[PDB]
């Protein structure tokens, strides 16, 4: 059921999980919750998501609470600015330390509580 895009396979889950249980599921399939590092990847993801909300690999790191990617892709604050839903990350209720794809737009990301359950997207490198 994995979908292929530019050197990576992607798994769009059928069952919802908390952010961490999702990441664990990805790790069990030799993958990680997806990073997003280009306009074309954002576009591939939100179109495939079809208007439903999916956990991606966005999570906070460091004392400053900077955003990071669980797959260890360095997070680029400048290049990622265009990918958030206007108003996000808003840190609602001071408890939104993980990120999902929510809106079917390039401006797609929302921060939400890590313990909420959503469908999720795994990303696995293809290695010829
Ligand atoms: O109003 C926007 C707000 O809606 C809900 O409260 C949650 O999804 C938050 O993550 C989001 O910031
Ligand atoms: Ca939010």
Author numbering: 198 to 325
Could you give the paper's own sentences about this structure?
Electron density for both sugars in the disaccharide is seen in two copies of the CRD, whereas only a single-mannose residue is observed in the other two. The disaccharide adopts the preferred conformation seen in other crystal structures. Unlike in the Man4 and Man5 structures, two orientations for the mannose bound in the Ca2+ site are observed, each at approximately 50% occupancy, in each of the four crystallographically independent copies of the Man2–CRD complex. One orientation is the same as that observed for the terminal mannose residue in the Man4 and Man5 structures, in which the 3-OH group coordinates Ca2+ and forms hydrogen bonds with Glu293 and Asn307, the 4-OH group coordinates Ca2+ and forms hydrogen bonds with Glu285 and Asn287, and the 2-OH group forms a hydrogen bond with Lys299. When the full disaccharide is visible in this orientation, the residue at the nonreducing end is in the primary binding site, and the 4-C of the mannose residue at the reducing end packs against Ala289. In the second orientation, the sugar ring is rotated about an axis perpendicular to the C3–C4 bond, so that the partners of the 3-OH and 4-OH groups are reversed, and the oxygen attached to the anomeric carbon forms a hydrogen bond with Lys299. In this orientation, when the disaccharide is visible, the reducing end residue is the one ligated to Ca2+, and the second residue does not contact the protein. In the first conformation, the chain can be readily extended from the reducing end. At the other end of the disaccharide, glycans in which the 6 position of the mannose bound at the Ca2+ site is on the reducing side of an α1–6-linked sugar can also be accommodated, since the 6-OH group of this mannose points away from the protein surface. In the alternative conformation, the 6 position of the nonreducing mannose is away from the protein surface, allowing elongation from this end, and an α1–3 linkage of the Ca2+-ligated mannose to GalNAc, as in polysaccharide 44, could also be accommodated.
